[PDB]
Amino acid sequence: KGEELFTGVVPILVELDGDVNGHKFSVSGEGEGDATYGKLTLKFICTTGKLPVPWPTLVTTFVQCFARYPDHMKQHDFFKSAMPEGYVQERTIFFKDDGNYKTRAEVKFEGDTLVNRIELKGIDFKEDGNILGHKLEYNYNSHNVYIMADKQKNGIKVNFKIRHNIEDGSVQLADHYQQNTPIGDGPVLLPDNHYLSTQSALSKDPNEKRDHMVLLEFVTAAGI
Amino acid sequence: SMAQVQLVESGGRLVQAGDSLRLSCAASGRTFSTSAMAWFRQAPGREREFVAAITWTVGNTILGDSVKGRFTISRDRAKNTVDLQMDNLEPEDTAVYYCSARSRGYVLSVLRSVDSYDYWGQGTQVTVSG
Ligand SMILES: [Cl-]
Ligand SMILES: [N+]
Ligand SMILES: [N+]
Ligand SMILES: [N+]
Ligand SMILES: [N+]
Ligand SMILES: [N+]
Ligand SMILES: [N+]
C-alpha cells in the first residue's frame, strides 16, 4: 500500500513548462508535504524571467496525495494508492469570460522525492483581461474539490470552481475539470464520492530577487 | 499520447584492457514520462547483470558492485540520452551492454533489477582484450 510512503515528511520537486497566448515560460519548485497533517509547503521560481500570467492562476497546477484522509476514509485515497508508480493528472481550466489552460502532469516518486512534472497550454486570453493584464490579487481562498470514481478509466474524475479575487473587488471564476489515472497496472482504490477541503496561502521570500511564489496548502478529505 | 519509448545504444567497441570507452543511449517516443534509465550487461551463459542506473529528474546514480569506482553514468534531459563512461576496462567487462528505461515512479531499491524497466534497447557489444 502506497499510504506507507506518506507517513512522514516527503520532499517534493515541481517542474512546469508553459505557453499562454504564445508566451513561453518555465517554473521550478521545491518543498515538502506531510500527509499526516494535510500540509504542503512549496516555493516556485520562474526560471525564464517574468511569469506572463498571475501566480495565483497556477496554484492548482503546482499533489493531492498530500491530503489528509481521515482514518474512516482511507478506503478512498486513490492518490496515495497509486504511488510509488504514480498517476497522470489532466485538467482543463476555463476562466470565466477569458481563455483556458489545458494541463498534463505526472506525479510519481523517484526514490524518496515526490515529483510533479507539468506541461501547460493556454489560449484565447484577452490581452486586456484579468489574466494577461495581471489584475488578480496575490492571495487565495478555500474551495471544496469534488472527487468521484471513473471505473471505466480505472481512475477518478474531479471538479471544482476556484474564486480568484480581482483587484477591483470582483471575482474571476476558474472552472476546473480534472481526471487522474494510474501509471502502473497495480490495483488502485476507486473511491466513493467525497471531496477535499482545500485552503491555501500565498506569500513572498523577501530575500528572493527572482519572480517567485511561496505556497502553503492545507488539505483534508471529508464527506463520509 | 503513446507510451512507447525507443532506445538506441551506440559506442561499443573492441578495446584493450586498461583503456576507457563511453557508451551512449538515445531515447525517443514519450520521453516526457521517463523517471529512470539504466545500463545492464549480458555475457553468454550468464544472467543479465545490473551495471548502473540514474534517476531522471535529479540525476542520482547507482552503480553495480563490480564497476564501482570505474564506471560513471550520466544523463542529458535536453537530448534524452544516458551515457556510460567506462574507465580501466578489464576482459571481464566483455558483454553486450543494454540500455533500459522506466516511466513508473519507484522506490530506489527496485532499480537494480532487470524487471523494473518498461523499455529496452537492442544492445551494443563491448569486447575487452588483455
Ligand atoms: Cl483581446
Ligand atoms: N502574481
Ligand atoms: N492552476
Ligand atoms: N491523498
Ligand atoms: N462548494
Ligand atoms: N475548504
Ligand atoms: N507519445
Short mmCIF file of C-alpha atoms and ligand atoms in Angstrom, two decimals:
data_model
loop_
_atom_site.label_atom_id
_atom_site.label_comp_id
_atom_site.label_asym_id
_atom_site.label_seq_id
_atom_site.Cartn_x
_atom_site.Cartn_y
_atom_site.Cartn_z
CA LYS A 1 0.00 0.00 0.00
CA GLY A 2 1.25 3.40 -1.08
CA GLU A 3 -0.17 5.06 2.06
CA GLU A 4 3.03 3.78 3.63
CA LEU A 5 5.20 6.20 1.64
CA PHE A 6 3.39 9.23 3.18
CA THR A 7 3.60 8.65 6.95
CA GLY A 8 6.48 11.12 7.36
CA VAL A 9 7.67 14.34 5.67
CA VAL A 10 8.27 13.83 1.94
CA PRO A 11 10.42 16.17 -0.18
CA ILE A 12 8.89 17.49 -3.40
CA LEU A 13 10.17 18.71 -6.75
CA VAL A 14 7.93 20.53 -9.27
CA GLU A 15 8.67 21.40 -12.91
CA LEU A 16 6.32 23.18 -15.30
CA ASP A 17 6.72 24.12 -18.95
CA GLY A 18 4.08 26.55 -20.12
CA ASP A 19 2.87 28.54 -23.11
CA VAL A 20 -0.04 31.01 -22.81
CA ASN A 21 -1.00 33.01 -25.91
CA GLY A 22 2.45 32.24 -27.29
CA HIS A 23 4.34 33.39 -24.17
CA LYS A 24 6.64 30.57 -23.09
CA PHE A 25 7.97 30.18 -19.55
CA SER A 26 9.30 27.54 -17.19
CA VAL A 27 8.94 27.20 -13.43
CA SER A 28 10.75 25.02 -10.92
CA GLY A 29 9.71 24.37 -7.35
CA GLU A 30 10.70 22.56 -4.24
CA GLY A 31 9.44 21.98 -0.77
CA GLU A 32 7.82 19.18 1.12
CA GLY A 33 4.49 17.67 2.04
CA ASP A 34 3.22 15.98 5.19
CA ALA A 35 0.07 13.94 4.64
CA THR A 36 -0.38 13.23 8.32
CA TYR A 37 -1.16 16.95 8.79
CA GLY A 38 -2.51 17.53 5.27
CA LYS A 39 0.22 20.11 4.84
CA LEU A 40 2.19 21.17 1.78
CA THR A 41 4.85 23.92 1.54
CA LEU A 42 6.38 24.84 -1.81
CA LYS A 43 8.49 27.63 -3.27
CA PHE A 44 8.46 28.37 -7.02
CA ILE A 45 10.86 30.31 -9.25
CA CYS A 46 10.14 31.44 -12.80
CA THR A 47 13.44 30.40 -14.38
CA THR A 48 12.80 32.22 -17.69
CA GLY A 49 12.33 35.73 -16.24
CA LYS A 50 8.88 37.18 -15.56
CA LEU A 51 5.84 34.97 -15.32
CA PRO A 52 3.47 36.05 -18.15
CA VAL A 53 0.39 35.10 -16.10
CA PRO A 54 -0.56 35.79 -12.46
CA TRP A 55 0.96 33.38 -9.95
CA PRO A 56 -2.44 32.52 -8.35
CA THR A 57 -3.73 31.15 -11.66
CA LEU A 58 -1.05 28.40 -11.48
CA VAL A 59 -1.66 27.38 -7.85
CA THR A 60 -3.85 24.36 -8.56
CA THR A 61 -1.48 23.17 -11.32
CA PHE A 62 1.55 23.34 -8.98
CA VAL A 63 0.00 16.98 -5.48
CA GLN A 64 -3.22 15.88 -3.85
CA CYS A 65 -1.58 12.74 -2.49
CA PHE A 66 -0.65 15.05 0.40
CA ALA A 67 -4.24 15.39 1.54
CA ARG A 68 -5.02 14.09 4.99
CA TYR A 69 -7.51 11.25 4.63
CA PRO A 70 -9.27 10.66 7.96
CA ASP A 71 -8.92 7.04 9.04
CA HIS A 72 -12.52 6.14 8.24
CA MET A 73 -11.88 7.27 4.62
CA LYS A 74 -8.58 5.54 3.91
CA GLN A 75 -10.55 3.27 1.53
CA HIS A 76 -10.98 6.25 -0.82
CA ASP A 77 -7.47 7.78 -1.09
CA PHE A 78 -6.79 7.00 -4.71
CA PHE A 79 -3.84 9.41 -4.89
CA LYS A 80 -1.77 7.58 -2.30
CA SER A 81 -2.81 4.17 -3.59
CA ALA A 82 -1.21 4.88 -6.97
CA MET A 83 2.30 5.54 -5.61
CA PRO A 84 5.14 4.91 -5.93
CA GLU A 85 4.38 4.20 -9.62
CA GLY A 86 2.36 7.46 -9.66
CA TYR A 87 -0.50 8.92 -11.64
CA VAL A 88 -1.36 11.21 -14.60
CA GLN A 89 -3.25 14.43 -13.79
CA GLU A 90 -5.01 16.27 -16.60
CA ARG A 91 -7.15 19.37 -16.27
CA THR A 92 -8.85 21.92 -18.45
CA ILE A 93 -9.39 25.21 -16.62
CA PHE A 94 -11.99 27.60 -18.07
CA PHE A 95 -11.51 31.19 -16.92
CA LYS A 96 -14.89 32.95 -16.94
CA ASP A 97 -15.09 35.35 -19.91
CA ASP A 98 -11.49 34.54 -20.86
CA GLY A 99 -9.30 31.71 -22.16
CA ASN A 100 -8.43 28.29 -20.85
CA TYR A 101 -5.46 26.35 -19.55
CA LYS A 102 -5.01 22.74 -20.60
CA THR A 103 -2.52 20.82 -18.45
CA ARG A 104 -0.80 17.43 -18.47
CA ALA A 105 1.06 16.23 -15.37
CA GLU A 106 2.65 13.08 -13.96
CA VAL A 107 3.03 12.75 -10.18
CA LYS A 108 5.35 9.97 -9.02
CA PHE A 109 8.20 9.05 -6.70
CA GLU A 110 11.80 8.99 -7.84
CA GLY A 111 13.25 7.38 -4.72
CA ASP A 112 12.38 9.49 -1.70
CA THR A 113 11.23 12.60 -3.66
CA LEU A 114 7.67 13.14 -4.90
CA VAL A 115 7.99 14.68 -8.42
CA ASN A 116 5.27 16.65 -10.26
CA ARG A 117 6.12 17.37 -13.94
CA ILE A 118 3.64 19.57 -15.83
CA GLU A 119 3.01 20.83 -19.34
CA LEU A 120 0.61 23.76 -19.62
CA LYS A 121 -1.00 25.35 -22.68
CA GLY A 122 -3.26 28.41 -22.56
CA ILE A 123 -5.07 30.04 -25.47
CA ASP A 124 -7.68 32.68 -26.35
CA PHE A 125 -6.95 35.01 -23.43
CA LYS A 126 -7.83 38.68 -23.81
CA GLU A 127 -4.81 40.96 -23.70
CA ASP A 128 -6.97 43.29 -21.55
CA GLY A 129 -8.36 40.56 -19.29
CA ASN A 130 -7.79 39.71 -15.67
CA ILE A 131 -5.10 37.16 -16.51
CA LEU A 132 -2.86 38.72 -19.15
CA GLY A 133 -3.44 42.18 -17.67
CA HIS A 134 -2.36 40.97 -14.18
CA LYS A 135 -5.46 42.10 -12.26
CA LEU A 136 -5.63 39.17 -9.81
CA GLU A 137 -4.91 39.81 -6.16
CA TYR A 138 -1.94 37.85 -4.78
CA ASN A 139 -3.97 35.63 -2.45
CA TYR A 140 -6.15 32.53 -2.38
CA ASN A 141 -9.42 31.28 -0.93
CA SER A 142 -10.89 27.98 0.31
CA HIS A 143 -12.62 25.56 -2.03
CA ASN A 144 -14.04 22.06 -1.97
CA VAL A 145 -12.56 19.64 -4.51
CA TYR A 146 -15.17 17.08 -5.58
CA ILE A 147 -13.88 13.58 -6.38
CA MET A 148 -15.78 10.68 -7.95
CA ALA A 149 -14.63 7.38 -9.39
CA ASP A 150 -14.29 6.72 -13.12
CA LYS A 151 -14.42 2.90 -13.20
CA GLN A 152 -14.04 2.69 -17.00
CA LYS A 153 -10.70 4.61 -16.95
CA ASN A 154 -9.60 2.93 -13.67
CA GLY A 155 -9.23 6.45 -12.26
CA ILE A 156 -11.13 9.42 -10.82
CA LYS A 157 -12.96 12.47 -12.16
CA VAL A 158 -12.62 15.74 -10.25
CA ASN A 159 -14.13 19.20 -10.48
CA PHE A 160 -14.26 22.48 -8.60
CA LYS A 161 -14.57 26.26 -9.09
CA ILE A 162 -11.68 28.43 -7.93
CA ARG A 163 -12.60 32.01 -7.00
CA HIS A 164 -9.82 34.46 -7.94
CA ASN A 165 -10.25 37.81 -6.18
CA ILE A 166 -9.74 40.69 -8.62
CA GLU A 167 -8.02 43.88 -7.52
CA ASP A 168 -11.23 45.93 -8.06
CA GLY A 169 -13.32 43.74 -5.75
CA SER A 170 -14.87 41.48 -8.39
CA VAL A 171 -14.24 37.73 -8.50
CA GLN A 172 -12.91 35.81 -11.51
CA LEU A 173 -14.06 32.16 -11.53
CA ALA A 174 -11.84 29.42 -12.94
CA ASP A 175 -13.80 26.24 -13.68
CA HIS A 176 -11.66 23.09 -13.23
CA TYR A 177 -12.28 19.73 -14.93
CA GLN A 178 -9.84 17.05 -13.91
CA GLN A 179 -9.07 13.37 -14.34
CA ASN A 180 -6.44 11.11 -12.82
CA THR A 181 -5.39 7.68 -13.98
CA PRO A 182 -2.65 5.41 -12.57
CA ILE A 183 0.67 5.00 -14.32
CA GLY A 184 1.23 1.43 -13.16
CA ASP A 185 -1.02 -1.56 -13.63
CA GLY A 186 -1.17 -2.25 -9.91
CA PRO A 187 -4.63 -2.02 -8.40
CA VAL A 188 -5.85 1.32 -7.09
CA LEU A 189 -8.58 2.47 -4.71
CA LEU A 190 -11.61 3.72 -6.63
CA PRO A 191 -13.39 5.97 -4.12
CA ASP A 192 -16.95 6.71 -3.20
CA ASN A 193 -17.95 10.30 -3.84
CA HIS A 194 -16.23 12.69 -1.43
CA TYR A 195 -14.27 15.93 -1.51
CA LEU A 196 -11.07 17.59 -0.33
CA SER A 197 -11.43 20.73 1.75
CA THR A 198 -8.58 22.88 0.44
CA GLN A 199 -7.08 26.05 1.92
CA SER A 200 -4.06 27.88 0.58
CA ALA A 201 -1.98 30.96 1.41
CA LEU A 202 0.46 32.76 -0.89
CA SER A 203 3.44 34.86 0.22
CA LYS A 204 6.94 36.02 -0.70
CA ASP A 205 10.53 35.45 0.28
CA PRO A 206 11.97 38.97 0.74
CA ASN A 207 15.48 37.53 0.25
CA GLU A 208 14.41 36.34 -3.23
CA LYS A 209 15.20 38.58 -6.19
CA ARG A 210 13.58 36.42 -8.88
CA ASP A 211 9.88 36.30 -9.68
CA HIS A 212 8.61 33.62 -7.34
CA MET A 213 5.80 32.31 -5.15
CA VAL A 214 5.70 30.75 -1.69
CA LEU A 215 2.69 28.46 -1.42
CA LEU A 216 1.09 26.87 1.60
CA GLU A 217 -1.70 24.34 1.33
CA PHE A 218 -3.83 22.56 3.91
CA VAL A 219 -5.96 19.71 2.61
CA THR A 220 -8.29 17.29 4.45
CA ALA A 221 -10.73 14.80 2.95
CA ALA A 222 -14.38 14.81 4.02
CA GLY A 223 -17.85 13.66 3.02
CA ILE A 224 -18.19 10.17 4.56
CA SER B 1 -0.08 10.13 -26.15
CA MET B 2 1.56 6.77 -26.96
CA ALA B 3 3.64 5.48 -24.05
CA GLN B 4 6.16 3.69 -26.34
CA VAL B 5 9.82 4.68 -25.88
CA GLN B 6 12.60 3.55 -28.22
CA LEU B 7 16.23 3.19 -27.10
CA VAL B 8 19.30 3.07 -29.37
CA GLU B 9 22.68 2.21 -27.84
CA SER B 10 25.94 3.17 -29.53
CA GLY B 11 29.68 3.17 -28.90
CA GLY B 12 30.56 -0.46 -28.18
CA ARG B 13 33.99 -1.40 -29.48
CA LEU B 14 36.77 -3.88 -29.18
CA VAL B 15 39.32 -2.31 -26.86
CA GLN B 16 42.47 -3.12 -24.88
CA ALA B 17 42.39 -3.76 -21.15
CA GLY B 18 43.02 -0.62 -19.12
CA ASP B 19 41.52 1.57 -21.84
CA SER B 20 38.29 3.50 -21.43
CA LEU B 21 35.15 3.69 -23.56
CA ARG B 22 31.97 5.79 -23.50
CA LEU B 23 28.62 4.27 -24.40
CA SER B 24 25.54 6.30 -25.17
CA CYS B 25 21.82 5.65 -25.39
CA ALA B 26 19.24 7.75 -27.25
CA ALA B 27 15.61 7.72 -26.09
CA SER B 28 12.70 8.89 -28.24
CA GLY B 29 8.93 8.50 -28.02
CA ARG B 30 7.17 9.62 -24.84
CA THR B 31 10.33 10.78 -23.14
CA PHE B 32 8.24 13.19 -21.06
CA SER B 33 7.34 10.28 -18.76
CA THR B 34 10.89 8.99 -18.14
CA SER B 35 11.75 8.51 -14.44
CA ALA B 36 14.91 6.36 -14.53
CA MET B 37 17.34 4.95 -17.09
CA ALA B 38 19.91 2.20 -16.69
CA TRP B 39 22.62 0.06 -18.27
CA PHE B 40 22.72 -3.75 -17.89
CA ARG B 41 25.17 -6.15 -19.47
CA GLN B 42 24.95 -9.76 -20.54
CA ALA B 43 27.65 -12.27 -21.29
CA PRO B 44 26.93 -15.70 -22.86
CA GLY B 45 25.85 -18.36 -20.36
CA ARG B 46 25.30 -15.71 -17.67
CA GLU B 47 22.29 -13.90 -16.26
CA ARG B 48 21.87 -10.28 -17.27
CA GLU B 49 23.71 -8.15 -14.71
CA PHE B 50 22.94 -4.66 -13.37
CA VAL B 51 25.63 -2.09 -14.21
CA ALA B 52 24.32 1.41 -13.39
CA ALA B 53 21.11 3.42 -13.03
CA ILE B 54 20.27 7.15 -12.88
CA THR B 55 17.11 8.90 -11.62
CA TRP B 56 15.84 11.14 -14.32
CA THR B 57 14.85 14.38 -12.62
CA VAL B 58 17.63 14.76 -10.07
CA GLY B 59 20.40 12.65 -11.61
CA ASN B 60 21.05 10.39 -8.60
CA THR B 61 23.23 7.44 -9.65
CA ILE B 62 23.54 3.80 -8.56
CA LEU B 63 26.46 1.56 -9.58
CA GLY B 64 26.75 -2.21 -9.57
CA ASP B 65 29.33 -3.59 -7.19
CA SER B 66 31.75 -4.83 -9.84
CA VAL B 67 32.10 -1.48 -11.68
CA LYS B 68 32.13 0.87 -8.65
CA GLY B 69 34.94 3.37 -8.98
CA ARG B 70 35.39 2.58 -12.71
CA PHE B 71 32.07 3.29 -14.45
CA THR B 72 30.16 6.56 -14.45
CA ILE B 73 26.56 7.05 -15.57
CA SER B 74 25.21 10.45 -16.62
CA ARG B 75 22.15 11.69 -18.48
CA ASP B 76 21.15 14.74 -20.53
CA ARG B 77 17.47 15.62 -20.37
CA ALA B 78 17.59 18.11 -23.26
CA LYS B 79 18.85 15.35 -25.60
CA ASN B 80 17.21 12.40 -23.82
CA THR B 81 20.47 10.48 -23.66
CA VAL B 82 22.17 8.50 -20.94
CA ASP B 83 25.88 7.78 -21.22
CA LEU B 84 28.08 5.13 -19.54
CA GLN B 85 31.71 6.16 -19.09
CA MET B 86 33.83 3.04 -18.61
CA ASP B 87 37.39 3.61 -17.42
CA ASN B 88 40.03 0.97 -16.74
CA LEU B 89 38.27 -1.75 -18.70
CA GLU B 90 39.01 -5.40 -17.92
CA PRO B 91 38.40 -8.55 -20.00
CA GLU B 92 35.53 -9.40 -17.59
CA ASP B 93 33.64 -6.27 -18.71
CA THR B 94 33.20 -8.06 -22.05
CA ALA B 95 29.47 -8.38 -22.70
CA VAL B 96 26.61 -6.85 -24.66
CA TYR B 97 25.54 -3.63 -22.95
CA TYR B 98 21.82 -2.87 -22.89
CA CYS B 99 20.12 0.43 -22.21
CA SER B 100 16.77 0.50 -20.42
CA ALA B 101 14.19 2.96 -19.22
CA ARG B 102 11.35 3.21 -16.72
CA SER B 103 8.35 5.52 -16.63
CA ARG B 104 6.57 4.35 -13.50
CA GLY B 105 7.84 6.02 -10.36
CA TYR B 106 9.70 3.84 -7.89
CA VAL B 107 11.48 3.48 -4.61
CA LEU B 108 15.22 3.38 -5.14
CA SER B 109 15.91 -0.27 -4.32
CA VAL B 110 13.96 -1.69 -7.29
CA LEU B 111 16.27 -0.01 -9.83
CA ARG B 112 18.94 -2.73 -9.76
CA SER B 113 16.50 -5.31 -11.06
CA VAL B 114 16.06 -6.21 -14.73
CA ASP B 115 12.29 -6.47 -14.18
CA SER B 116 11.97 -2.82 -13.14
CA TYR B 117 12.20 -1.30 -16.64
CA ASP B 118 9.48 -0.83 -19.25
CA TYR B 119 11.70 -0.33 -22.32
CA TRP B 120 14.92 -1.91 -23.58
CA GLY B 121 17.35 -1.25 -26.37
CA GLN B 122 18.89 -3.96 -28.51
CA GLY B 123 22.39 -3.74 -27.10
CA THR B 124 25.87 -2.72 -28.14
CA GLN B 125 28.88 -5.04 -27.99
CA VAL B 126 31.90 -4.33 -25.79
CA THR B 127 34.92 -6.62 -26.05
CA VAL B 128 37.97 -6.04 -23.83
CA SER B 129 41.17 -7.91 -24.66
CA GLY B 130 44.25 -8.33 -22.47
CL CL C 1 -8.36 40.81 -26.98
N N C 2 1.21 37.48 -9.46
N N C 3 -3.57 26.24 -11.86
N N C 4 -4.16 11.77 -0.74
N N C 5 -18.87 24.23 -2.78
N N C 6 -12.06 24.49 2.34
N N C 7 3.93 9.57 -27.39
#
